[PDB]
Each structure stands twice: as structure tokens, then as C-alpha cells.
Amino acid sequence: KEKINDFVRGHFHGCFDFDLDNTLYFFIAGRYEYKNKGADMFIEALARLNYRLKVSGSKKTVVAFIVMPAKNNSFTVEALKGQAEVRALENTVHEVTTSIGKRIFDHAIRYPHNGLTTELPTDLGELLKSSDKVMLKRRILALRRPEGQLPPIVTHNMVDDANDLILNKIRQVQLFNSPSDRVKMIFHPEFLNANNPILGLDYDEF
Amino acid sequence: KEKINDFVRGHFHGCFDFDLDNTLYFFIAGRYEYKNKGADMFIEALARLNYRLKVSGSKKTVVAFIVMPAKNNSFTVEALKGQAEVRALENTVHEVTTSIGKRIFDHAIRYPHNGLTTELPTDLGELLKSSDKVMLKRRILALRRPEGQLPPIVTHNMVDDANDLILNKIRQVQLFNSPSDRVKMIFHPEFLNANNPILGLDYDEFVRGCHLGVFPSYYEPWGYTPAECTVMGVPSITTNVSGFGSYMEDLIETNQAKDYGIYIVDRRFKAPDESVEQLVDYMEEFVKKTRRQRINQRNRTERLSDLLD
Amino acid sequence: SRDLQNHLLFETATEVANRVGGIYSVLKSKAPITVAQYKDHYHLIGPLNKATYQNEVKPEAFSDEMRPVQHALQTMESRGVHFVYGRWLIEGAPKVILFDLDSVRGYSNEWKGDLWSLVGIPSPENDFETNDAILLGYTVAWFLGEVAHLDSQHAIVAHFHQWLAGVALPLCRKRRIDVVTIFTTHATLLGRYLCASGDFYNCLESVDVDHEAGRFGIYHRYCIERAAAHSADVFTTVSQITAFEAEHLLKRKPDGILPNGLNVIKFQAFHEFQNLHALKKEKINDFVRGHFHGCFDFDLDNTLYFFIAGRYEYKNKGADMFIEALARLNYRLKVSGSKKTVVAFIVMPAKNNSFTVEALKGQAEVRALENTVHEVTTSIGKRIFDHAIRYPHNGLTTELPTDLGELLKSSDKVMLKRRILALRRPEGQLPPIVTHNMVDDANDLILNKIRQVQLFNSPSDRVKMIFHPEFLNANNPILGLDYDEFVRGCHLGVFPSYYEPWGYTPAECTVMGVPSITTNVSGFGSYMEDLIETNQAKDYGIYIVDRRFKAPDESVEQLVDYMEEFVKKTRRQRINQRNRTERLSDLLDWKRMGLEYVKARQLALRRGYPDQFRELVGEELNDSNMDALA
């Protein structure tokens, strides 16, 4: 589930208004038989489940996956690019916390001398400096989404996007991952695998 | 130098009141001959330097190492235990900052949503929790040292402490590492090694980490100790009655040679109490140097190593 | 009347509180050295950019001796003129005076009329910009008259940058305002325009200045530039090649050069710049592994990183030569059996739709391998450790493991192999020559040139092409470097320019210890070929290609010659050459290039008050140049 959470954090970069500790992951998977496998019901049922959860004022979120292989031209740039921009933040944060560590450790080993009245630092400014902030802000701006763009409902470029049953059905019931929706949709038109650069999980792990 | 800094932090746990970024590492080394190798003069000179700095009001700090093997029963528990207590803290800090990361990270990626009005956390309480603050304080507590205890002048338990010359000389000049002393004193009666559990540097590595070798010998046919120093771009103070000292006095004009890291004290044509003041002059000069200066001097000292090939 | 030892300085340009062009960065970086000399006697002047100025910008306001500046500001207020006073928020904190041109346009037709008779300059009012150039030039001379009038202690210097600011120069000359003037032109008008087609440097001695200016239809601007250069007590350019250029095309030899320095950020240790190089070289190495994923047949340790960067001017910046030359070098290197490799970067912004999937995906797959390795190596760690500590018990005869199968298990071998296969690229696919999706790929000039010389990053090629049509930035998810960080990590900048009045590209490059190849028709190349003998300058990291007294094809062959030279170097040799280049940086710091700005100002006071300067120094020194003076 941590590897999924990681994928999701990328996916909703810029539009991430919910709590993964209070988030659930439904999926459907298999051969793309829209009608026999019941993708139709699934999508419809989810659209309604969304309405119920909104009405009840629940704070939970459902991120719902469709793993049915359809013809595609691999991943989208937007998928790969935001998963990269989220790692960029992860890393800059790790660097910054290394610096904070030095600053804490100096205070801890220098107490009680040099006028260090408290055992630990108290002001955040003692630990976090302009150079540190500037990085973090730049990495944050990189995650900003455009004017009103919503997280996508598909991870790939589809061959025949306009005729795709699953996608037309999601568009029809209007699950577009706008913030208010407590049900999110992610169609991944490709069997899962560990080499997958955006959700590196063999199916069995996912 | 970092590896020496980790040792010193250990050694001074509790009584740590100076900045290692404005601290210099002098050392004397080799076969324990109190009189011949110049340890008498060294320790005295340092006590006089300690006076000069307090007087002149210097922000600097000197940690003077003595590496001369002597009869001993291995390390003190207090050196060995303090090393562990300083690492306990290093590893508690590393855990806390991880927690801090996760929080900073969550804020960044969530902003501007969920009522987050600033791009970064502003108040420290968002990052640093009580559970985190408790483990840290406990680690700090373990570094406290007893009422009026000071950092030791010895890293080992001596066989015959009460009669050892080096230890008695230090006690006599009254360098007990109190916070008001600008010169500290760490006698390590054992040849340095990488497997040393308090200071895990081979001798050559330690040399590089230090700032200034001081080998003010009285008898010394050659003196590899300052020669090795000089090969590693480390300024050394030696004497004209040493072989190496005499040789470098031939090759270079004695006032040039200070810019080239080879300080030469006069122990042939001067009173022993004038020798000591010249050795103190040279140390007080080096302490006055900026980092610009030390680095440049170190490059000159390095470039000089061709002559010793 | 006036004092020359304590004088005022009023620097005036278009680009004060707004980064419209190169001139921005000159004034900005120079401000620290010019504040430090003058303190409160220095004042920058320009037009108030209502939009962006919000970013960058009482009896207490001035001292007693600098009260005359305060009184003259109130006299501009007494005819209604709105003006922003303050500090410019950059190193040095110089004081700015930003005139509102919206609150002086009611004079426009009168003032454009005045120019018909005072100098004779037409003003087609369908030219949005020359209007603003005239409004500033009159508003500033309306101010400099009042300060010369209200201050009778100091001498006064008024420096103007580029033709747009210098409408005020004829007005200071004709009206006989009591200030000494300096004009500095960073590029001639005709020069930029004549270089459109292409042979500028040979056949500019004979060109009809008025017929040519008239044919491009920019005669009304040319007039303002020509007027400015003649009017001023001192006329200057930013480089010798531009001085040559300015002599024939503006009809006045300059009194000297004001070459553009940089605010050189120094380190406490000199050798720090060198450690950075290797750090940032590793970030590029990370990129290059991702790029060649699957076709990775060379040793990055024995690999060099050439680059060109800047505005996308295919001809002027010399991308044409760079690519042609790189193709020829590839032949040489193959012929000569060299084992080295060159990855050449072109960093010139072109219209794109961000990165390719292949680019992002490739470096994602390389990170997956990085991490699966990291998992496997901890397992190996655990096994080495357990053999170590258990020795010599349980039958362990050797101190350490000797069979790899002891440390690397099936489970570990499988996931490494899977990661390997993921990097495998389609049969006969090569590494791309572009990181992005181009909007108009088939018509991109760089990509046509590259396709034509057939640098396609096949494994036999010792020169690889990477066109990255976008300025470098830290946030970039494939090559996460700010431009400065990338430069440092590279080994050789190559900026074989044709029209380039200065070129900060190679100067920046040199500041950060990186050798460049520039040309003798660039302003920076002129200035170094004067300061250093040209064969010696190669040892200090300044390779200068002759694009003036050589055929285009010989220039190319010289550029190839120089690269081949640089490739041949050993690592010691590159490291030192880099050290020599870094030592050179002080010549480009404002702590030296700002002395030439004083020489211009000492010559302005010499011609302006010949008797007063004679008596304040001793005799009268030579009058003709900046260089001929004290």
C-alpha cells in the first residue's frame, strides 16, 4: 500500500486535498470485456457511491483502479513527469532534513553553554534557513497544476481514446477526479508489472 | 579533520563550549622521549600560549594532541563511553529529522489545500513532537558530566600515572581543559591506528586532519615526524638542532620558510627561555591566521614535498 | 566653480527595474562596485515599468550636501511629473529614480517637433518605442538641467546606455547643460540588421549608412543613435569589435572600451570550484546514463561534455559551425582510433510540447535499477558481515567470501535481470538527438543540420548529439540542474559566434573555470585576444576562432582543430587548464572591469573642465583616449 500511496501522490500532484491514511483502494482487473467483466456496473456503482459519500459528509476517499489492457501508446508525459516532480520534492526534503539534523545536533551537544537556555531549539528559524526554504518552494511550484486542470482518469495515451468503452463510461457518469468527488478514477489500460515506471508493482503485489 | 572532530565532541561531552569551525589541531608525536623529542617545551609553550590568547581575547581554540606510547592498561571507560553516548545522540537526531522530513514533505505536497495558507511550515511545533523531544533530551542528559568534572587530559589508564613525565608536566602548567582555557590537552599514550575504537584514524590520516605539527626536538639526527608532516601539506614547527630542521634552514631563508609551513625554532644560539618564547611566537602567529591563509600556506607546504623525495 | 574629486554620477538606461535585455545584467552586477565608490552620490535613472517594478524596488531622504538632488525632484513634481524614488533590491542597494512616462505624454508632439529643428530626426508615431525613448530623453534633460542649476559644489557626470536612453545627449549638448556626458552603445543598430543575411566584417567599411538605414526602414532610430554618440563628451562601446563596428557605422571612433564584468562569486578555498565541477558532472552523468539506456557502450570517466547555449539564433550564435565541426571531429576521432567520447549539448529554447515519454521513462527505468541494486547490495552486506564475524567457526576457512554465490542469490539475480531487460531498447533504436517533442520538428534548423551531418548517436560515433530546446532549470525532471550548475559540470563551452557585441555566455563560462571556444568577432573574444597572446590563451582556456580573416570553411577547420586539441588532453592537463581559467576570472570581475568605467568618467571631467583638472592634478595629460589619461 505504500507503493500505491507513492503512485497516488504523484498522480494528484498539485490537486492533493485528501488523506491517504483515510483513503481506500478499490480495483477491478482482467481482460477488457466491458460487459462480461462488469466494468459498466463498476463505473456506474462508483458514480453513485460518490453521491452517497458526498451526501453523508464522510471524509474518506476512494481511489478506484481499472486494470484492463486496451490498445495504447505507452504512458503519458503527464504521468511520468509528475512522478518525477514528486521525487524531486522527496529528495530536496531529504537534503534539507540532513541540514536540520546538523543544527539540532549542534544545539544538543552545545547545551547548556554559549547561552543556550533551552535543551532543544524552539524557533523554527534556528533550523530552517533561506537557502533551504528557497529550494522547497521551487520544488513545490513544480507540482502546481495549471489553471483548473484536474488529475487524469487515465495513465496512458489510448489509441482510440474517443471510442474507448471504459473511458466513455467514466466521462458519461462524470467522475473527473475534481476535489469534491470522494471517488477517484484511474484507468490503467495495461497489465501491472514491476518494471512499470509509474506504479512499479507486479499485479500480485498491487 | 571531521573524524578528529567526532572524537573531540566525544571527549568534551558535557563541557563543550567552543566552535570546531574556529578550532585548530596541534599535535606532537612519536617515541616517548620526554626531553629529546621536545614534550617539555611543547607543553610549557602551550601553557604560555593559553595565557597570551586569554590576554589578547582570542575567539580561537587549540586542541593539542600528544601521541607518545607509554605503559598503559588500555582506554579509560570515560573516553570509550562518551564516544557511544555521542553516537546515541547522532542516531536519535537522524530518526527525529526523518519524522521532520515526512511532515515537511506532507505540507509541501498538500499545499495549498486543507487550510494550508503558507507554502512551508512556519511554527516548529508542526514538525517536532513531544515523543521526539523526549528521546532527544534523554540523550542530552546522558552527556551531562558530574558537578565540576572537566574533560580528561588522558584517553587511557596509565600504569604509573603519578610519576609519568608528560602527565606531571601538564598538571604542573595547570592545563586541565576548563572552559576558560583556550588551549586544550589530550594525551593519547598509544600509537594511532584505524582500529582504535575512540579515534579510528591511522597515523597518516590524523596528520592530514590536523592543522600544525610541533616537534621542537633537542636531539634528533633527522626527524621523519616533521618530514612526513611536510609531505602531507601540514605545516610543522621544528628546531635547528634537529637534522631535518638544519637541512630546511640551508635550503630556505628562515623568514621565507614560515610562509612555506616550516617554522624553525632556535635551540642552539638562544637561552632555553628565549627558545620557548620563540616557539610561543610561532604558535600565536599561526592562530592569528585566517582560513584563506592556512589553506594557501598548506599548498605551499605541499608544493615543498618534491625536495624531500 | 565645481569640484572634480567629489562629483555626482547619474547612470541612465531603458532596462533599470526590468529585465528586457542583456543590459539589465550589466547595470545590476556593476551596482555593488559603483555604490562602494560613490555611496549616496550614485543614482540610476530609467522609465517606470508599471507592470514588473513592484517586484524590484522627507528631510531624512538625503544628506545636507545631497539636498540639491531633493530640491530638483520637487521641481519636477512642480510641473506634475510622477516619479518613483527608492532602492533597487539587489547586491549593493543602489538608489533608483524611475520616471513615469504616462505622466509626461502631453508634451509628445511638441517634443517630437523640437527634434525636427534641434537635430533633424523624424518620428513616425506608429513606432511605439521611439516615442518612449524621446519622452525619457526630454524628461531626464528636464531633470539634469535643474540639478546642474540647483547644485553648485560637485561636478556632474551623466552616463547613458544604449540609443533608447540617449535622446538626452543632443539636448545636453545643444542646450549647454553643465554636466559631462558619457554614451555607451552595447550594439549598433545597422550591425544587427546587416547580419540578417550574410559578409559583414569585411564589407562594412564601404556601406551606405543612410541608404541602408533607409532601406531597412529604421532611419528614425539610427538618427537617435548617431546623435547620441556624437553629442557625448565621451563615446564608448563594450568591445573592440563593436568599437570598430561603431567607428564606420556611427561615424565616430570611440574613446575606449567599457567591457561588461560580472559580479564574481568567490569561494573561501580556491579549489572549491573544482569540487563542484565533479559534483555537477555526476548529475550530467546520471542524465547521460538515462539517455543512452540500452545503447550504453562507452566509459563516462573517459567522456567529455561540450556544450553551446543561449538565445536560438542559428547563424549568429554559431550553431551552424558547432554542429558541422562536431561532425568533422567525429570523423577525426574515429580515424585516429581515439577511445574518448564527446557528448555535445545544445541548449537553445525552441517551441516544444515538453519532454518526450522516452526521455522521462528512460531515466525512470535507470532509477529502478539504481534502487534494485541498492536492495541487493544491502543483502550482500549482511552476508559479508555474517561471514566476517563468524570466522573462523562453522567451517569457514577463508576470512572473507570467495564464491559470489555465497553473497548473490537467485531471488537477487532475478530482479536485477528484470531491471536490465527493462532498459533494453527496441531492435535498431538509437539514442535520440532531442530530449523534447518539437512543435515543428521538420523545420527546426538545428535538427535539420544534425540530420544532414548524420550525427544520430550510433555506437560507432565518438561524438554524440543532444539538443535540449529549453533553458536549463533545477526543476527539470530529466536534468535537474540550474544553468550555472550544468556549466560547471561540463568540460568545454563552445560559442563560435558571428554577431555578438559581447557574449556573457563565454564570460560566465570562464568565471566558473570552464574553458570556452569563442571568436574574434565576438566582443568577449576581441577583449581576450587583446589582453592575451592567442596561442598562450589556449593554456588559460580561451580558444579564439578567426571568423574575420578566414574563409568560412577554414574557421570550421580551426574550430575542429581546437576541439581535437582539447579532447587529446589527459585529466591532469584538464584540471590545471581549469585552474588557469579560474585564475583568469578576476580580469572579468567588476573589481577590474569597473576601473575602465572610472577611466571613462575621468576623461569626461578632463574635456569638460580642462583648466580645473589641470590645476587639481598638475600638468594637462593627453586628451584623446581613456588610456592616454590619468
Ligand SMILES: O=c1ccn([C@@H]2O[C@H](COP(=O)(O)OP(=O)(O)O[C@H]3O[C@H](CO)[C@H](O)[C@H](O)[C@H]3O)[C@@H](O)[C@H]2O)c(=O)[nH]1
Ligand atoms: O495486471 C494484471 C491483472 C491480471 N492478471 C491476471 O489475469 C487473470 C485475469 O483473468 P481474465 O480476465 O483473463 O479472465 P479469466 O482467466 O478469469 O477467464 C478466462 O479464462 C477462462 C479459462 O480459460 C474461461 O475460458 C473464461 O471464459 C475466460 O474469461 C488473473 O488470473 C490475474 O492473475 C495479471 O497477470 N496482471
Ligand SMILES: O=c1ccn([C@@H]2O[C@H](COP(=O)(O)OP(=O)(O)O[C@H]3O[C@H](CO)[C@H](O)[C@H](O)[C@H]3O)[C@@H](O)[C@H]2O)c(=O)[nH]1
Ligand atoms: O601514532 C603514530 C605516530 C607516529 N608513527 C610513526 O613512527 C615514527 C616515530 O618517530 P620517532 O619518534 O621514532 O622519531 P624518528 O623516527 O623521527 O627518529 C628516531 O629514529 C632515529 C633512527 O633510529 C634515531 O634513533 C633518532 O634518535 C630517533 O629520534 C613517526 O615518524 C611515524 O612514522 C606511528 O606509526 N604512529
Ligand SMILES: O=c1ccn([C@@H]2O[C@H](COP(=O)(O)OP(=O)(O)O[C@H]3O[C@H](CO)[C@H](O)[C@H](O)[C@H]3O)[C@@H](O)[C@H]2O)c(=O)[nH]1
Ligand atoms: O540554460 C540557460 C542558458 C543560458 N542562460 C543565460 O542566458 C544568457 C544567454 O544570452 P543570449 O545568448 O540570449 O544573448 P546575450 O545575453 O549574450 O546578449 C543579448 O543581449 C545583448 C544586449 O542586450 C545583445 O542584444 C545580444 O544580441 C543579445 O543576444 C546567458 O547570460 C546565460 O546566463 C540561462 O539562464 N539558462
Ligand SMILES: O=P(O)(O)OC[C@H]1O[C@H](O)[C@H](O)[C@@H](O)[C@@H]1O
Ligand atoms: O576534468 P574531469 O575529467 O571531469 O575530472 C576532474 C576532477 O575534478 C575535480 O578536480 C575532482 O576533485 C576530481 O575528482 C576529478 O578527477
